[PDB]
Design a protein around this ligand. Sequence first.
Ligand SMILES: Nc1ncnc2c1ncn2[C@@H]1O[C@H](COP(=O)(O)OP(=O)(O)O)[C@@H](O)[C@H]1O
Lengths: 465, 461
Amino acid sequence: MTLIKHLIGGELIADTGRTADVFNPSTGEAVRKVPLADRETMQQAIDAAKAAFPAWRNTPPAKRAQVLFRFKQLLEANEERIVKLISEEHGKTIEDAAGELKRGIENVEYATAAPEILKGEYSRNVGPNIDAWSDFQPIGVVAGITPFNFPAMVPLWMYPLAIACGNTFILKPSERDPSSTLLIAELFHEAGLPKGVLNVVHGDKGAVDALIEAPEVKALSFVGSTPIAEYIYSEGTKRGKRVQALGGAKNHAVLMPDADLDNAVSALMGAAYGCMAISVAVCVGDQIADALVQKLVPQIKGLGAARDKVTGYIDTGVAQGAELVVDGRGYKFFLGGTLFDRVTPEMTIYKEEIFGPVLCIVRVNSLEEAMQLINDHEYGNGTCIFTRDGEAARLFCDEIEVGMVGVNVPLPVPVAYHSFGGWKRSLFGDLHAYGPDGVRFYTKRKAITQRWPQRKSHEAAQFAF
Amino acid sequence: TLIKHLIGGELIADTGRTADVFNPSTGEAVRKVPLADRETMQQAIDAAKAAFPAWRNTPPAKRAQVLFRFKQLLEANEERIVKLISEEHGKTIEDAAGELKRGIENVEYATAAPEILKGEYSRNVGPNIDAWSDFQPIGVVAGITPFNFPAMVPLWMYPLAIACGNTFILKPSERDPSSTLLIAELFHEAGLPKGVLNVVHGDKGAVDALIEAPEVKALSFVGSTPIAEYIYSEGTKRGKRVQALGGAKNHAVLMPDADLDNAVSALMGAAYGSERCMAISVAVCVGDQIADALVQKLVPQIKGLARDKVTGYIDTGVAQGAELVVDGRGLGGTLFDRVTPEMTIYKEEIFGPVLCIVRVNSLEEAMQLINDHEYGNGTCIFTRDGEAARLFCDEIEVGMVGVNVPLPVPVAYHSFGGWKRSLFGDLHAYGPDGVRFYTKRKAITQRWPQRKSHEAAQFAF
Ligand SMILES: Nc1ncnc2c1ncn2[C@@H]1O[C@H](COP(=O)(O)OP(=O)(O)O)[C@@H](O)[C@H]1O
């Protein structure tokens, strides 16, 4: 543990040039250094992947499935070692880190069976001496840009599927916890993956701009924050690339007047403080809002530049006219449960996401207004409605635009993301249900019609030297 | 006479801005068309927004039913329709009837879309928690259609979108809008509720209206590449789903070993006026021999059967050093040799019977040429070599490929964005892409939290 190496062309490269430091969130002490890569160091990876592609594309489906199956085993073998490397640079419960990797492995298990659903049809003499067939081909060299949370699972949600489909991959992970990701890359090479099929290149905005600029890379896949997502989406798409982009968002719960309050409070307390991501509670009518606050407050007492970040957030909230009902700042400098009431979508505390236990209550007069509020912003990947009315619930499920909906029940969607464009993937849905969307993003359909026009005779004079 | 809009189930007469529809075989104006303002569009939008909730909840089988009668009423009125196509677009009635036969195949596919749209139900997936999954319509959607194909391109959009349970605003071409409107009316005659399909005639104003309207959730366009890029970028910028096909150029590759009579036959089928007929506008020849030979054969056969725009096009071609081998100024029938991708005649898309030969030294160069531009929807390679053909099929990026055989792709289009649909593919193969464009997937989990007692005091009056 001194300097972390790139994984280009099957060998580990040491870059010395620009460099940042990876810290240990639970200690504070910088542990290692990471190389912010130049366009030359990226072009290496691109050339490596471009070179590996034709061989890999023609590798038999069953052989690709085989190398993935061993990759799954070698991950289930080295779990302890990996999980340690996650908790060390990200700082999270080893139990959480292990649960993340279990998900990554589910993604690898799904990828092993992608070759099966990718077989196409053949027809001899669809017309006179004309054969026809259809295939699903890989698109070429593709790249994935991964976030800080989930250095294990988010890459394993991208590249195994893309490689199973027969592409080659350049992975540019987060600078802040890149060791765990790189280990998993190496294990894939150890499982049997040819050189150049997966490459790992560490870096920052430079590295990413490199991939956005490179005309060889055909598809670009990103999960992180909403500004960076919009960037990569628009700038990628305008250069003919396929772009899949999940950007951070806010999930909303709606409370109708008839909501069973103990049930809603249970969901909100698990989601905002206590598993689902919810950051805004839209209340229809003032009664249910006043009542919700009455119940929330007791239960929330029941439980350096970042210090200035949160104080700034809260302070702006008060400044713009929100009611700060529970201020979670305290000692043991932690941020406990914070509750804001009387929040509006023009406030900064609604528009800006803040890390940690913060709920905003937004008061609204009708269900239509609540649904319009949720639909008109960068809507997330989960939403709830709490009500006893059947007609309300049916309408909410019909007109809300969020993909997963919970009626009096929270959803297994632990982080909120908005999905850009038409190349849409779900991160937290059932893999078997949303996997085809991944497969379609990493493949192109091809439809061939073929005829070999005839000769009258086939004497040696009709061929070459 | 004057052509009426079809908003909210009734025919409206607009008088305001107006253009003239000509009878383009016999270049002489036959009718007038109303270029609509934002108010006349907002009428349609409001009509469609109103019709949506009822239509969305109409049973699958009832939607299938109205589509099935729509198919019959088209097969009933074919003669009348085809006449109206040939009259304002100007094309052989046999072609116009073949177009409508395709439109009807689109309607037949839409009738069966309700079946593939059923989802799952599971009682107690968790303790007293039900779960289900559904494919819902998205709302009010709009389609903007081109001059070529006033019958089939709309029937490729709205029947499927309506079968999925949306409502539709159709803004057809100003230049041949009679035939499209007739088919709209027949749909109403088949039983379609008022407001579910609306037809609003217009131009850039009308289109900008739909691009601006926040009620319309998806926008579907087929036409020229500049207008396509416009609608794509500006539509996606406003949160809409946009499906866009923009005019392009299909390329044929000739290897040295190509059977020339076979290639010439395919290239010569690719005809322009005013089951496998193909659009090809560029013939990439590998090596000079096959190119010289191709020219030798093409010239005699080019005695076949906007005008001011393309004198400029041809003139620029000569100016930049292309060899003008057959000059079609007058009936058309133009051939250019020694064309390069830096010329304007390669970059700009051209009205009419124009073929450009591009000489290249390797197959790799030919494939790179085709791949590096806004590639079309069809391509051919002519060769006897198996390895060449396999490689071409592997590395070319065009979706449909013909090896020594032309493809049934009569117009070239490039597809923008991630909402991609094929216009000329097998409907059963590319139909799901349409279905996905006009629907949104939902996963619902539901629980009704219990009460301890259910006396009348626990409910409302
Ligand atoms: N300004 C930027 N432009 C382009 N890419 C960036 C930028 N900032 C960060 N990235 C890259 O995107 C990922 C981080 O995006 P971000 O939204 O900051 O995720 P997170 O903050 O959750 O780690 C990293 O992989 C990083 O390399």
